[PDB]
Amino acid sequence: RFLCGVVEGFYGRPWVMEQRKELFRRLQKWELNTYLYAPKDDYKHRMFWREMYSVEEAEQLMTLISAAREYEIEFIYAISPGLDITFSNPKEVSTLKRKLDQVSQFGCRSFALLFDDIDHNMCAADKEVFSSFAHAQVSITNEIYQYLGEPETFLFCPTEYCGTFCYPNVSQSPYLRTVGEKLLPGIEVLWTGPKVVSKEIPVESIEEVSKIIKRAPVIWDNIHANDYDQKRLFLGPYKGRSTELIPRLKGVLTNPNCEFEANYVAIHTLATWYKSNMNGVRDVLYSPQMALKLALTEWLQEFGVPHQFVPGPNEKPLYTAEPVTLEDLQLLADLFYLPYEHGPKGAQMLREFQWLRANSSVVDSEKIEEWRSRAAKFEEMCGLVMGMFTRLSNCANRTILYDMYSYVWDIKSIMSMVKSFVQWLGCREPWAFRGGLAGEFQRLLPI
Amino acid sequence: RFLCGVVEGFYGRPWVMEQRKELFRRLQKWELNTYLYAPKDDYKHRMFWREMYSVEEAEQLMTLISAAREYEIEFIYAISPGLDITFSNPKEVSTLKRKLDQVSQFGCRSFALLFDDIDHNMCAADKEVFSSFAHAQVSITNEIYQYLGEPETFLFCPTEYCGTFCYPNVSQSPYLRTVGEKLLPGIEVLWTGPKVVSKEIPVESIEEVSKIIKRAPVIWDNIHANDYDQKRLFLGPYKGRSTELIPRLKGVLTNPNCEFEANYVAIHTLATWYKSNMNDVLYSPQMALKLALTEWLQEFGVPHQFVPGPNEKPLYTAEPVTLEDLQLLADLFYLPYEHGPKGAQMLREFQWLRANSSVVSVKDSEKIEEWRSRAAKFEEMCGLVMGMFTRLSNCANRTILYDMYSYVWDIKSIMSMVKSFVQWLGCRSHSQEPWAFRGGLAGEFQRLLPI
Ligand SMILES: CC(=O)N[C@H]1c2[nH]c(C(=O)Nc3ccccc3)c[n+]2[C@H](CO)[C@@H](O)[C@@H]1O
Ligand SMILES: CC(=O)N[C@H]1c2[nH]c(C(=O)Nc3ccccc3)c[n+]2[C@H](CO)[C@@H](O)[C@@H]1O
């Protein structure tokens, strides 16, 4: 029994009910099976976790939860009291129990408590009662689990949720030792890998942590998350996780880009990864590059779908004529690929620009003929980025357009300027302030 | 009779009909009077300008247009055929006329044709008929104006819409000379100032262009526009335009931030500017900003028992957003060519602290006592940016939060890192997550250009 799907677990503008219904639809089509409701800034999830849902809010959650059952996706409600709960106050524990009973009235059978992103300092009352921060968390968690009748799937996200957050390391952490010994066996534990955004999750890192917490964990995967950097989007393939992991894990829930429509590849490729080795034996039949092409070829068909004049010989041609192509989306993904890696064409544009700039002073037959055609070849590629933008700009599926618009505009702006610089090397409005104030502070730090 | 209000004229995700109704409401409250519909990427405005509105789309525009009349705001429908219209084809002129009469069926009396952001190269058919690119534009424009019964308000946006786009300059441009001589007198002309994003619009620049186009222009102001830079937001006051301009202008329509809720200051301060000299001691940008933020503050506690003990952990949400929080936020995200006082000041102190870092380990009391307290004072201010973020994060008006979230998160992330660097400089006889790749690929190209 493997939990595989999406966690809406990011900071900023949560997804709306229409979009979450559409997610369940896509999860089912791709044979994924789980959704974890945990938007950091949906106010009643974390900030105002004590407040009960209003009647209007209750109706919308009921409809959402029925939608999940309709598409055979497990709905897990998570809640995050960590910032200001007094763990030892029964009033407080009761308020929590009320909130979770209210949601089970909506049709929800599966739950989670999250203690990611808080500090370890308890108040004085909690210090007296509980001998450590883990002892307090495991107390209310085991209690809530029992009060709800020991539900089939109940998740706990630790404060020390990855390799680099474990004090002083994973195998000797007093926080995790306590979680493994005292947290009841039928509660599953969330884990993001060796780091918060793990480039790779080695099998041996999972064996390690699996010993100290005493279960196979469920992975909260931040590979395609983009809440942490305004300028970033991730359209590259699920990567850096061996299919070998699957028999050593309880699940994988990916926390993907904030912009709903940009997660076609992120979720599609996760599904191809899961489906490739669904139930193994306790080294890959999964190719990230092949998975990316499957995903983009399918995504392409969404762009011509909402969510005569044919000019003469002498006349100005339709600006809309040409539709988005597979090569356009292949280019876009390489430009906005993965947290620790650009895609081939992106890496390659950067390498040619680095070369062209460093060998500029040349402007000798040998070196000129090289620089001139290399530069013309680079203008042509910068041309391909403009062409991509323009064809996206005209596509019928405006919903997708709007989710990406600001990223596609940014990359074509920069390539358009970079093209101008290379044209200016061959010939011998707000921009000084670029990135605003934040940009100026960033330029004064060791990059 | 002065046209003052907002043009929705930017690139990216247009505003939705609920938000435009709310805009009319705000325009009325502040005694502004005009809205110009012109979203670059609302598909039937420009890309698919030939396509008529569907029944569903027609109902929504009708409701929007009635909403405008209800709030006493002039509704101006603009259209942008410039990218692919063949000017000399009657079929093409007819398709344009159809589109504009469809919208007048919806209740619209005021119109506009826009030729910003296209190149000057005409097709071969148009070269034969018309002797220049201006001659073509002024032809269809005068014709459409007459066909619509010479409406009281009709706007034309030129291709050469500012100082720096005028070939070879404004006073000797053949494009503009043609527009001034031949464009019919009762059509008004849009203009963005000396540049696309004008820091200042001098009175003498307006006198100049007013001669060659032969009217007072209407300003399309891009002062608070932010479609051109992912990381930028503008919450500073309307600034750099003298109240003297008003009797020399036909109007001012501001093209503000993409994120609807961030335009409280931009529009509020424009209204204070217009109202100050309706018919330059009279308008102070700094005073106007405080009026605006004090009013905005009241929206943050409005959606769009347990009281913890002595020994217990207090409510994390207890403290609400304050006026000082929003004053700080605006200085951090102020104007295109200028940061606000506190922002400028944080940057100056950081620049100083970094450059005088070596003072930490060298025997020097004078310079240490200075660096230590200057640094502590800087930690305190970086503290205030986190405090701002966290109180915004808890505010009841989630609509506003969500519009700004990504900007407020970015600045508090960077200040939090910048604080760590200054703490690390103070521990210098004493020795991770995605950051090398910060800004993504685009960031790497930007770092290799002369800034
Ligand atoms: C378990 C987890 O990933 N929790 C949150 C989380 N927490 C963190 C960090 O805490 N990161 C961090 C902390 C200190 C210094 C650098 C980075 C990142 N994330 C994710 C990516 O931004 C975010 O979406 C998520 O809500
Ligand atoms: C009249 C006008 O401002 N037209 C458009 C416009 N046009 C331009 C440019 O002309 N941009 C430009 C020109 C040369 C080099 C870089 C950018 C900017 N803008 C505004 C700000 O991006 C945009 O919101 C607007 O629709």
From Swiss-Prot, chain A:
Effect in UniProt of substituting D229A: Nearly abolishes enzyme activity
Binding site for a protein: G9, K40, D116, D117, Y161, D227, N255
Domain GH84: start-end pairs: 2-278
Consequence recorded when altering V197 to G/T: Nearly abolishes enzyme activity
Tissue-wise expression: Ubiquitous. Shows highest expression in the brain, placenta and pancreas.
Catalytic site positions: D117
Annotated effect of mutating Y11S: Strongly reduces affinity for glycopeptide substrates. Nearly abolishes enzyme activity
The record's account of how the chain is modified after translation: Proteolytically cleaved by caspase-3 during apoptosis. The fragments interact with each other; cleavage does not decrease enzyme activity.
Subunit organization: Monomer. Interacts with CLOCK.
Family: Belongs to the glycosyl hydrolase 84 family.
Name listed for the protein in its UniProt record: Protein O-GlcNAcase
Organism of origin: Homo sapiens
Taxonomic lineage of the native organism: Eukaryota, Metazoa, Chordata, Craniata, Vertebrata
Gene name tied to this protein: OGA
Entire-sequence positions represented here: 59 to 695 of 916
